[PDB]
Structure 1
């Protein structure tokens, strides 16, 4: 029993973190096989970040300008290339600690663990969600760039995120491991609109199921609703519209608790309309949306 914002064990990712320096800028890199991946803004200076011409800045750089250090050992750089907003530095040694891995592009609403790093050294690990507007509400300071987001299935690490920047609004933006930004963001020091965010409805419902499994059931009511009625409430409260695909993913949790998905929607509807009345659910005084149905089943079953 109990429910926590649990991150994946970061061990397999820690063994991949390196420091990358180019000129005066130092950030984090990800060493997998004989390649080191890092944000391309490592080649910029303060005067450049306002509107950098990355093709031009990279042309002034040579392999010997990218200093890559894995703990205390120096890696020899034998190739460099820019793919989208990431740099790929080919090194002469394959990382002996490379786990089985995949590069995946996550969907908005999905979750992942972040291993915050500074100067190539892991500082901490936390779980978060990719917001519907493609931002992440992370915890990152100066030098955190290049820290990565990932999920772990059995022995395989799926890397889904690399950290690039903090928007003026204090929210975070980054890319997949092929250097494509999530959302409309560009790696430039400019005002960037993160559009309207919404609450991840399927995750809130999954968390309500987790609450019931753990004994918090005060919010369960005598009502039911329909997808149409519920979605009118979802619209009013800036919640993502619930689809039959979301109901289908909630199937196993509906089966485990015996609470029909639409009945749980009616509990959520009453909580949106009346609030919590000073009560809590799983130690929270608000509706939590950072746990997917998969996360709930994983935590409630003990998948290692």
Structure 2
């Protein structure tokens, strides 16, 4: 029993974190095989951050201008290229600790673990989700750039996020491992506003199923609803629309508990219209939306 924000064991990723310096700027890089991946803004200077021309800035950089350090060991750079907003530094040594890996561009609503790093050294690990507005609500400080997001399935690490920046809102924006930003964000010190952040409906429902499995059952009611009637309530409270694919993804949870998805939707509707009345569900006084149905079946069974 119990339910916690649980991250993947971070060991496979710790062995891949390196320090990348280019001039005055130091951030984190990801070392897999003979390539170090890092945010391209490592080549920027104080009077270059408002509107950098990365192609022009990179012209003035050679392999020897990129200092890569894995622990107390210096790596030799034998090649360099820019791919979207990420730099790929070819080094002459393959990382002996490289796990089996793949690069994945996650969909909004999906979750992942973050290993926050500073100067190439891992500091801590936590869970987060790609928000529907393509930001992440992380915990990052100055120097955390290059810190990665990942999932682990049967010893295979799927990298999905690289941290690039913080918006004036205090939320975080970044890319997949091919350098493509999630959302409309750009790597420059400019006015960037996030959109409306909606609640991940399918995740809240998965968390209500986790609460039932754990003995929290007060919220369960004598009512039911339809997909269209629930979605009228969902739109009102800025909840993302629920489709038949979401119902299908919740199948294992509905079958294990014997509670139909639309009956759980009716309980959710009552919670949205009435609130929690000072009560709690799984130790929380808010509806939690950062646990997918996968995260629930992994931690509850």
**TM-score normalised to the size of structure 1?**
0.99
Query: 1:228-267 to 2 correspondence within 5 Å?
Result: 228-267=228-267
Q: Deviations over 1:131-150 (max 9, x none)?
A: 00000000000000000000
Q: Deviations over 1:17-63 (max 9, x none)?
A: 00000000000000000000000000001111111000000110000
Q: Deviations over 1:142-164 (max 9, x none)?
A: 00000000000011000000000
Tell me, in whole angstroms, the C-alpha distance in 2 between the residues paired with 1:270 and 1:291.
Answer: 21
Following superposition, the deviation at residue 197 of structure 1 comes to: 1.1
TM-align CA RMSD: 0.4
Other structure's SS at 2:188 match: coil
Following superposition, the deviation at residue 65 of structure 1 comes to: 0.5
Following superposition, the deviation at residue 297 of structure 1 comes to: 0.2
Following superposition, the deviation at residue 193 of structure 1 comes to: 1.9
Q: Deviations over 1:87-139 (max 9, x none)?
A: 00000000000000000000000000000000000000000000000000000
Tell me, in whole angstroms, the C-alpha distance in 2 between the residues paired with 1:78 and 1:89.
Answer: 8
Following superposition, the deviation at residue 230 of structure 1 comes to: 0.2
Give the gaps of 5 or more residues in structure 2: none
Give the gaps of 5 or more residues in structure 1: none
Tell me, in whole angstroms, the C-alpha distance in 1 between the residues paired with 2:77 and 2:14.
Answer: 21
Following superposition, the deviation at residue 189 of structure 1 comes to: 0.5
Tell me, in whole angstroms, the C-alpha distance in 2 between the residues paired with 1:283 and 1:183.
Answer: 32
Following superposition, the deviation at residue 169 of structure 1 comes to: 0.8
Q: Deviations over 1:246-295 (max 9, x none)?
A: 00000000000000000000000000000000000000000000000000
Other structure's SS at 1:142 match: coil
Q: Deviations over 1:53-88 (max 9, x none)?
A: 000001100000000000000000000000000000
Following superposition, the deviation at residue 196 of structure 1 comes to: 1.1
Aligned length: 301
Tell me, in whole angstroms, the C-alpha distance in 2 between the residues paired with 1:121 and 1:193.
Answer: 31
**TM-score normalised to the size of structure 2?**
1.00
Aligned to 1:60: 60
